[PDB]
Scaffold this active site. Structure first.
Site, mmCIF file in Angstrom:
data_model
loop_
_atom_site.group_PDB
_atom_site.id
_atom_site.type_symbol
_atom_site.label_atom_id
_atom_site.label_comp_id
_atom_site.label_asym_id
_atom_site.label_seq_id
_atom_site.Cartn_x
_atom_site.Cartn_y
_atom_site.Cartn_z
ATOM 1 N N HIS A 1 -26.310 -21.709 -13.043
ATOM 2 C CA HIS A 1 -26.474 -20.438 -13.745
ATOM 3 C C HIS A 1 -27.119 -20.646 -15.109
ATOM 4 O O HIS A 1 -28.049 -19.928 -15.488
ATOM 5 C CB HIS A 1 -25.129 -19.729 -13.910
ATOM 6 C CG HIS A 1 -24.729 -18.889 -12.737
ATOM 7 N ND1 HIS A 1 -25.296 -17.660 -12.480
ATOM 8 C CD2 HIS A 1 -23.802 -19.086 -11.771
ATOM 9 C CE1 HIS A 1 -24.745 -17.141 -11.398
ATOM 10 N NE2 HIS A 1 -23.836 -17.986 -10.948
ATOM 11 N N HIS B 1 -12.976 -6.281 -5.815
ATOM 12 C CA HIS B 1 -14.291 -5.903 -6.325
ATOM 13 C C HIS B 1 -14.673 -4.467 -5.983
ATOM 14 O O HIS B 1 -15.443 -3.849 -6.729
ATOM 15 C CB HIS B 1 -15.350 -6.871 -5.795
ATOM 16 C CG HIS B 1 -15.262 -8.244 -6.388
ATOM 17 N ND1 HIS B 1 -15.364 -8.476 -7.744
ATOM 18 C CD2 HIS B 1 -15.079 -9.455 -5.812
ATOM 19 C CE1 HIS B 1 -15.249 -9.772 -7.976
ATOM 20 N NE2 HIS B 1 -15.075 -10.389 -6.821
ATOM 21 N N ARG C 1 0.798 -1.220 0.000
ATOM 22 C CA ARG C 1 0.000 0.000 0.000
ATOM 23 C C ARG C 1 0.834 1.275 0.000
ATOM 24 O O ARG C 1 0.264 2.366 -0.107
ATOM 25 C CB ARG C 1 -0.939 0.027 1.210
ATOM 26 C CG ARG C 1 -2.216 -0.769 1.041
ATOM 27 C CD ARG C 1 -2.030 -2.187 1.531
ATOM 28 N NE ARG C 1 -1.726 -2.221 2.957
ATOM 29 C CZ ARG C 1 -1.329 -3.303 3.611
ATOM 30 N NH1 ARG C 1 -1.199 -4.469 3.000
ATOM 31 N NH2 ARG C 1 -1.052 -3.212 4.908
ATOM 32 N N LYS D 1 -12.122 -4.776 13.233
ATOM 33 C CA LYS D 1 -11.107 -5.816 13.117
ATOM 34 C C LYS D 1 -10.593 -6.257 14.478
ATOM 35 O O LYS D 1 -10.040 -7.356 14.595
ATOM 36 C CB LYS D 1 -9.949 -5.331 12.247
ATOM 37 C CG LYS D 1 -10.069 -5.729 10.789
ATOM 38 C CD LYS D 1 -9.079 -4.969 9.929
ATOM 39 C CE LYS D 1 -8.733 -5.749 8.677
ATOM 40 N NZ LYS D 1 -9.940 -5.984 7.843
ATOM 41 N N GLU E 1 -26.370 -16.473 -8.597
ATOM 42 C CA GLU E 1 -25.292 -17.208 -7.949
ATOM 43 C C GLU E 1 -25.839 -18.159 -6.893
ATOM 44 O O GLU E 1 -25.322 -19.268 -6.723
ATOM 45 C CB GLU E 1 -24.286 -16.234 -7.338
ATOM 46 C CG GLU E 1 -23.793 -15.152 -8.290
ATOM 47 C CD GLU E 1 -22.539 -15.555 -9.040
ATOM 48 O OE1 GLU E 1 -21.722 -16.311 -8.474
ATOM 49 O OE2 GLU E 1 -22.367 -15.111 -10.194
ATOM 50 N N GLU F 1 -21.928 -23.155 -12.204
ATOM 51 C CA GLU F 1 -22.074 -22.490 -13.498
ATOM 52 C C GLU F 1 -23.210 -23.108 -14.309
ATOM 53 O O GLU F 1 -23.939 -22.405 -15.020
ATOM 54 C CB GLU F 1 -20.759 -22.555 -14.276
ATOM 55 C CG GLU F 1 -19.559 -22.004 -13.520
ATOM 56 C CD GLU F 1 -19.756 -20.574 -13.055
ATOM 57 O OE1 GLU F 1 -20.329 -19.767 -13.818
ATOM 58 O OE2 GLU F 1 -19.334 -20.256 -11.924
#
Ligand SMILES: *[C@@H]1O[C@H](CO)[C@@H](O)[C@H](O)[C@H]1NC(C)=O
Ligand SMILES: *[C@@H]1O[C@H](CO)[C@@H](O)[C@H](O)[C@H]1NC(C)=O
Ligand SMILES: *[C@@H]1O[C@H](CO)[C@@H](O)[C@H](O)[C@H]1NC(C)=O
Ligand SMILES: *[C@@H]1O[C@H](CO)[C@@H](O)[C@H](O)[C@H]1NC(C)=O
Lengths: 98, 594
Positions: free
Chosen positions: B360, B487, B151, B463, B384, B357
């Site tokens: 799906h 994401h 980072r 955390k 999903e 899948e």
């Protein structure tokens, strides 16, 4: 065709329901909305004849199909068309039912 | 008369034209997938240009159309879905700035460089080498070195770019007369017109809060066992009273923990299920995996899957003549074209993912009967979940032994039960609290109550309370570990993952409790259960034409999301954790930190 079969075009909008043995050729917009509209489309003016979607890699219920109908009238005019009537042996020098 | 028929033909024409043009666009994408040439790139770019122009024109057409006087439920939902366009009602400068900042963020993430400071010319890259050097290492000085240097050269374009994103999105929602853009994310779930079931946007986060509070004891027990076994097996550095620092997260943010399960192996002196000999004896391949998937669908009771899976879909990876990515790709090209592309591999977990899948694909086949507005579920977590339903059904050893993936004299005893319950725990609940943290923090930042530099305490406080993750040195101004998640930088609503897993667990309970299955509770399998397949097929077809909460309470018995099914499948898990977490103290102290 691999790239598509869109030479023909299917009509979708007819402001009057039809009867048996009636065709439609006119492409006039179904002007359901009272707003002014004529000729070139605009506010709520959609073309009757909509495009196609046809390609070999399609799945189920979207391939090009052909339909035929066999029709006829019932005896008002003298009967004209019919198939053969099954026959059999003819027989010679022996008793039969001719 | 009124504009009822005008709206009807408007939605109809949009559905037809969208079907045609989106089919062309998906055709361009699949041509790129089958063969990568620059002309294919130009063709798909042109298809996208045409599609964007068409979408903008349709939104402009739908902008005027009201919703109050039109009372048809389906018409109302379709019109309100079409009128929404996103970030076009702003001024062009904000839109172009948004485009530039998102593009530069994508560039800085994609090419963001970090490796060993020893041999940087040709070493392990961002993935997967960094994974195998973080999660498969014995010393931690280099591990934390890389972790906290990751980072120091990338987050500089992660935190302030995130701030520019959040301010632009907030102002766009202000133009849209909303508060934040995550509200628009969750707005896909919106439905109204049902008495008593008025559906706002905050009930989602409240229900998620309740579900995570129910989850919390389960992760308390899980982390207790993990800490005990790591102290039994890793006496190197971590103190007997310390915690789990940032150098031992196993991932780039600590999502999956099956890799860390190596440090928490309870019993290795008992055999368990393995399919290597069974897959190299009868020569299982992608063809045979798909054939046994067809057999699984037949045994469940679901109807057959269409011919697009037998001829049109390329069953194998594209050889070695060309090169392309092999991410799990279940593509609904359109009008009955259903294809599955991957880099085919045979593994029991890959067995489950392949059936995911193919679930799906089954859902796509189901909703293909609907128009373009209805060519999706009422929620984006349905696909999903319905895909993973059969995978979680196949996560149990019962039907793996039924399909002959091992000898029938192998013991289906308690040890495999406990170990696979813990495996499912590490799979899902090992990342769920992190999902809670990221989604709550991102809701706060989108709304804007939290100062951008306050994330040091509150987030880390979570955390310190929920996951048990610390750092040997506190983060600096531009350390933005939540942005390190893949994401979040991809314009993703990160609550739909949790809503999806809630949906899948609820449906698992629905198909495990109503299918008359008994014995060990996890051993329930949807194969050879006709009613389960029937009731599942009844549900996964309509899409968004009706409200989803009523159907959800029909299938399972929950008015909204609830992790009661999650612990229902995990009742053996919870009992085993209670059986093992009585030896000593369980939990961690917030004041103490390394
Ligand atoms: C891709 O196209 C090139 C030429 O256009 C051809 O040589 C190659 O075999 C094709 N590969 C595939 C997988 O279609
Ligand atoms: C909307 O109109 C259609 C007419 O085709 C009707 O069948 C449907 O029931 C109406 N919606 C509701 C919620 O009644
Ligand atoms: C329909 O199901 C039968 C029986 O499972 C199967 O043999 C057939 O291939 C299926 N049809 C298609 C188009 O796959
Ligand atoms: C259900 O029936 C199929 C054959 O119809 C069989 O192969 C399968 O083993 C049965 N289910 C179980 C759990 O044995």
């Amino acid at each position: 065709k691999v790239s598509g079969n869109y030479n023909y075009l299917y009509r979708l909008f007819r402001k009057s329901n039809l009867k048996p043995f009636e065709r439609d050729i006119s492409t006039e917009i179904y002007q359901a909305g009272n707003k002014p509209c004529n000729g070139v489309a605009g506010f709520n003016c959609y073309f009757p004849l909509r495009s196609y979607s046809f390609r070999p890699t399609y799945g189920v219920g979207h391939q090009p199909y052909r339909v035929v109908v066999l029709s006829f009238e019932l005896l008002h005019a003298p009967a004209t068309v019919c198939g053969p009537k099954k026959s059999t042996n003819l027989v010679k020098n022996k008793c039969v039912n001719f | 008369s009124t504009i009822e028929e005008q709206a009807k033909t408007f939605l109809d024409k949009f559905n037809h034209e969208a079907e045609d043009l989106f089919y062309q666009s998906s055709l361009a994408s699949w041509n790129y997938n089958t063969n990568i040439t620059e002309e294919n790139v130009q063709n798909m770019n042109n298809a996208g240009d045409k599609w964007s122009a068409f979408l903008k024109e349709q939104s402009t057409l739908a902008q005027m159309y009201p919703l109050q006087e039109i009372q048809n439920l389906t018409v109302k939902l379709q019109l309100q879905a079409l009128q929404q366009n996103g970030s076009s009602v702003l001024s062009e400068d904000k839109s172009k700035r948004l485009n530039t900042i998102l593009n530069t963020m994508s560039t800085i993430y994609s090419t963001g460089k970090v490796c060993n400071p020893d041999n940087p010319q040709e070493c392990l890259l961002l993935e997967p080498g960094l994974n195998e050097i973080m999660a498969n290492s014995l010393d931690y000085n280099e591990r934390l070195w890389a972790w906290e240097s990751w980072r120091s050269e990338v987050g500089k374009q992660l935190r302030p770019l995130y701030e520019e994103y959040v301010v632009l999105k907030n102002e766009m929602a202000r133009a849209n007369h909303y508060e934040d853009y995550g509200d628009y994310w969750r707005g896909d779930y919106e439905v109204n017109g049902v008495d008593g079931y008025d559906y706002s946007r905050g009930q989602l986060i409240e229900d998620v809060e309740h579900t995570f509070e129910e989850i919390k004891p389960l992760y308390e027990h899980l982390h207790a066992y993990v800490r005990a076994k790591l102290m039994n097996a890793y006496p190197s550095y971590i103190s007997p009273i310390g915690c789990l620092p940032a150098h031992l997260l196993g991932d780039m943010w600590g999502r999956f923990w099956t890799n860390l399960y190596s440090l928490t192996v309870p019993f290795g002196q008992k055999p368990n299920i393995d399919v290597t000999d069974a897959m190299v004896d009868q020569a299982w391949d992608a063809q045979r995996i798909f054939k046994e998937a067809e057999k699984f669908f037949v045994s469940v009771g679901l109807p057959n899957m269409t011919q697009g899976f037998w001829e049109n879909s390329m069953l194998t990876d594209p050889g070695n003549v060309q090169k392309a990515v092999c991410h799990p790709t279940a593509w609904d090209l359109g009008k009955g074209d259903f294809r599955i592309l991957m880099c085919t591999k045979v593994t029991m977990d890959d067995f489950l993912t392949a059936h995911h899948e193919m679930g799906h694909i089954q859902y796509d086949m189901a909703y293909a009967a609907q128009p373009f507005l209805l060519r999706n579920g009422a929620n984006e977590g349905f696909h999903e979940a319905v895909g993973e339903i059969m995978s979680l059904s196949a996560a149990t050893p019962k039907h793996l032994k039924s399909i002959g993936l091992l000898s029938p004299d192998f013991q289906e005893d308690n040890e495999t039960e406990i170990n696979f319950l813990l495996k499912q725990a590490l799979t899902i609940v090992g990342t769920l609290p992190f999902t809670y943290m990221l989604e709550k923090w991102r809701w706060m930042v989108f709304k804007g109550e939290i100062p951008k530099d306050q994330w040091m305490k509150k987030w880390w406080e979570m955390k310190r309370e929920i996951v048990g993750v610390v750092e040997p040195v506190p983060h600096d101004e531009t350390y933005c570990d939540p942005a390190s998640l893949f994401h979040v930088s991809n314009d993703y609503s990160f609550i739909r993952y949790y809503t999806r897993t809630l949906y899948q667990f609820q449906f698992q309970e629905a198909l495990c409790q109503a299918a008359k299955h008994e014995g060990p509770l996890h051993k329930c399998d949807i194969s050879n259960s006709t009613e389960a397949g029937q009731k599942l097929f009844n549900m996964l077809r309509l899409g968004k034409s009706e409200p989803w909460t009523l159907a959800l309470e029909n299938v399972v018995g929950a008015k909204n999301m609830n992790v009661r099914p999650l612990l229902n499948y995990f009742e053996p898990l919870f009992t085993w954790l209670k059986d093992q977490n009585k030896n000593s103290f369980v939990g961690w102290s917030t004041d103490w930190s390394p």
